[PDB]
Structure formats: structure tokens, C-alpha cells
């Protein structure tokens, strides 16, 4: 009985567990060293 497994493989073929695909960089305003970090790992759609 392959029909159900076939449909499963067809989806699985396009499935990926990606890492951050949208790396944004920040231009801090606050001059404080308390937050001089410029990396934003945002999650695209």
C-alpha cells in the first residue's frame, strides 16, 4: 500500500528545516556599549 507513503515522500522532498534566512544588520543609536550588537536573525515569511 504505497499511495499514502508516496504522498508523504512527495511533500518530504520539498521540506527543509532551514537556519536563519534573513540576517539583518543594525545601526545602533544608543552610544552605550550595553548594546553594540548589530546582528538581527529575523525569520522571513
Amino acid at each position: 500500500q504505497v499511495d499514502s507513503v508516496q504522498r508523504w515522500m512527495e511533500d518530504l522532498k520539498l521540506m527543509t528545516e532551514c537556519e536563519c534566512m534573513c540576517v539583518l544588520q543594525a545601526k545602533p543609536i544608543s552610544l552605550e556599549e550595553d548594546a553594540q550588537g548589530d546582528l538581527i536573525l529575523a525569520g522571513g515569511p
Binding site: D3, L12, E17, C18, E19, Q25, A26, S30, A42
Partner: protein, 355 residues
Amino acid sequence: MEASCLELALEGERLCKSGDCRAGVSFFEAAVQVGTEDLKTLSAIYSQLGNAYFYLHDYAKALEYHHHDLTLARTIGDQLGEAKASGNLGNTLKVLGNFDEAIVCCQRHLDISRELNDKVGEARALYNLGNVYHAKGKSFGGEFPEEVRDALQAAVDFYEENLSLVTALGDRAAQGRAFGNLGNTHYLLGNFRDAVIAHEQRLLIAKEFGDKAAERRAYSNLGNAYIFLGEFETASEYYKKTLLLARQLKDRAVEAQSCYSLGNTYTLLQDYEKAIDYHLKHLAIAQELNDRIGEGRACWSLGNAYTALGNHDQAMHFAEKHLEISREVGDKSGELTARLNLSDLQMVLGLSYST
């Protein structure tokens, strides 16, 4: 004492740093209205507005503000400022499907970084270019389109370059992200073994950081790649590990998806008893999260597994459940197949008695 541009700006900044970009946006918007002659600060305002809107999923507005930042950075001659804006504008254009311009923006970021001798910036640009080509590759459409292949190969190239530089800089976490995306790109291309090899490194690195989510992702990607290598037993080992991790991170959805993959894998190994077990665990969680579509998938699978075991009676039950679920969710193909499965099982039974 009407607030100054800088004051409003700093409030928007901390507001966004606290997760509430919807409010930060407001302050940043106001600051622009008040105005300033400090173009370097105005540049940061736009950049942060663009990044905040991006986070809010208002890509059209993220585009507008990143466009503004890029233009201003160029007007005032801020090199690092131009590089950062080019990268941000590129990620936005990528999401919006404008891959040609995204590539140009990200290539711009790469060039300026190399000129400034900004190694980490160079790494960030290579990774962005890799991400853009990866998206481009997935934006098409039994022939595998050459345009999809060229784009994905382009991604592998940039990811490898990023990986090379990032390991030379000793940035372990960035190496992890590089490995994971490199592995997923190979997966989509059909380079399963190299996918496996890259994911093993992603797994390795995730453990070093005690990053459970990353670890779970790696196990899932590994399992999937082994499925397509025809190495089912090996795949099952990895799906079990994702199951444990998922069970451990209290993720019901992912735990269900894991049980479903295990059900299918064991069906491929022709161990229908185990398939039943895992498909049942998936059935339950599906019912729990009230996921009818997946419950249908479950009944469909269970019916097949029981049929493969010779358990006619149990097959009938699930085919019925499948037919029911299929009609309730308006699934045509499923309704018909569940129907065909029911009449066939009824035939098998009725014909099992002499005339």
C-alpha cells in the same frame, strides 16, 4: 518641552529591543517628523525603521526605509553604512521576490566589505548572497529546471565561501548556520550525501552550544536525506532522535510530524506493526490539536498499514474514518480513494464466503 528627534529615536530603539516593534515604529516615525541635521543618526533611524517593519512583516515599508538608508548612506559617504544598508535592502528585496536587485545589493555589501577589509562583514555578505540564491532557487514552478539548479548551485558556492571564512574567523555559531543551509540546499539539489555530511556538522555544533532546537532541526534534515538515499533503517534512527528532542522541548506538533515520518519509514522497512504504533501516536496528537487534515492522513495511513498486515476488520474502520474526514474537510481525491478502499474491503469480505 516637546521631545527631540534623538530622544524619540532612543525610545523607538529600546522599544524594538524589547520585542515591541509596533510601538518603536511609532517613535521612529515621529523622530523623522521632528527632523535632524545629523544625517548619520537619521540614517540609523531609517535602518531601524526598515528592520522593525521587516520584523512586523510589512516588507513594502521595510523596502521603503532600507531604500532611504542606502541612499543616505551613499549621499554622506558612509562606507560601512552603505554596506549594511545594501545587505538589509537585499534581504528585503529577496523576500519580495526581486532576486536580481537583491543579488546586486548583496554583491555591493560584499565589495564594500572587502574594500574596508571588514572580514566579519565579508562573511555576512557571502551568507546573504547564499540565502538569496537559495530563495531564488525555490521561486520557480518531471524535468528539474536548469534555472533552479543554477541558483541552488550558486547558493552552495556562497555558503561554502561563507563557511570557509567563518571557520577561519573562529565563529562557531556562524559555522553552524552555514552548515545547516548548505545541507538544505544540497537536499533540494539532490546531493543527499553532502547534505548528510553538512547536517552532521550542524548537529555537532548545535550540541556544543546546547542548542536543542538546532539539534532537532539537524536530526530531521538527516532523516529526510537518508530516506531519499534509500537508507531507511538509518533514517529511522534519526527520526527517533527528533522524536525524543521534540518530546523533550514539549513540541506536540513536531512530535506528531516525527511519529508520522516514523510510521512511513517503518512502512518502507515493511514492519507494519511499528508503523501502526507510530501512526497511532500521530493520530492521537492530531486529534488533540484538533488537526482534521492530519487526522485524515492518519486514518488513510492506518488503513493501509492494517491492510498490509491482513487485519481486514481494522482496515474497514479507518477507511470509514478516512472517508468521513475527507468529506468534512472537502478533500475530493481522498474521498474517492477512501471510497475505493471501503468497497474493496467490503468485496474482500463478501467474496470470502462461497456462493
